């Protein structure tokens, strides 16, 4: 699915602007590394509760991610 | 933090806009190929939505899903 894969790549790029590796925000964010990497590849279906795990750990509203 | 919690806040998003387009929450069901019980559990924070069922509803709301959040 195409819009999975465009906000893994969203996800990608403000992860990557921060300077985090995946191992990082997984961390940050209470999630598996791998887990967060098949997000960032559209290979996952994410939930909303960690959506906004992931957006605290970038520190922006989860809005930002769509 | 419990972002469990912000689902409540989540729901009555949606269900603010499923109601700005008068639509039930049948109808918006079927328009995002879902069932009742789930887009009621989701307007009630009960349920966990994911990602491809929030871009299904944004779909059959005619709105970014940006708008949503």
Redo the contacts between chains.
């Keep these: 699915?195409a819009?999975?894969v465009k906000?893994g790549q969203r996800l990608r790029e403000l992860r990557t602007a921060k300077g985090l590796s995946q191992e990082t925000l997984a961390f940050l964010s209470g999630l598996d590394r791998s887990y967060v990497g098949g997000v960032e590849r559209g290979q996952r279906?994410?939930?909303?509760?960690n959506?906004?795990?992931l957006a605290?750990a970038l520190d922006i509203?989860?809005?930002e991610l769509?």
Aim: a neutral charge.
């Design positions: 699915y819009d999975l906000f279906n994410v939930s909303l509760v959506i906004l795990k605290t509203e989860p809005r769509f």
